[PDB]
Write the structure tokens for this entry.
Amino acid sequence: SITSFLTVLAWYPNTLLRTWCLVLHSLTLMTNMQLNQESTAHLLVSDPNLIHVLVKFLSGTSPHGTNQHSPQVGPTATQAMQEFLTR
Amino acid sequence: LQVHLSSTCPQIFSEFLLKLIHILSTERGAFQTGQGPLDAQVKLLEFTLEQNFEVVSVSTISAVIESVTFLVHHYITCSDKVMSRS
């Protein structure tokens, strides 16, 4: 299931920022889970699709953005990513 | 440029300009991400409209049309979720 989400997210381009925060929230929630014995954090970090999603997230391209004034994601997204990385 | 070489060979220049169009709309190009001078882009494209493309090679026209169609389709389908008026 985790592999399916990561590959479809990495493959899919133009993922909205609101969807980006939803995704980040869900990733924190899923990382809190264990699997049934290598850790899930090691599995999620190991594959390069995490690189691709983070590159998309942090590049903030927004190719449909008629209002590309401030690429800032807002304090909510920053706090979500900070807690995620802390986890 | 056009008025000086139109007498000899506009076709090769047409092929160059289409190459520029293809590279500016290719993967990770400027046009998709929206950066670059918008006014310059509209002026170049409108000037391009007036050119004659009689003996342009089929391969480069096919390449540019596929590239622009893919880019614009991905732009329209994945359009923005808000729109602000003045």
In short: Chain A has five helices and no strands. The interface with chain B takes residues 13-14, 16, 18, 61-68 of chain A (CB under 8 Å). The two ends of chain A are 21 Å apart (CA to CA).
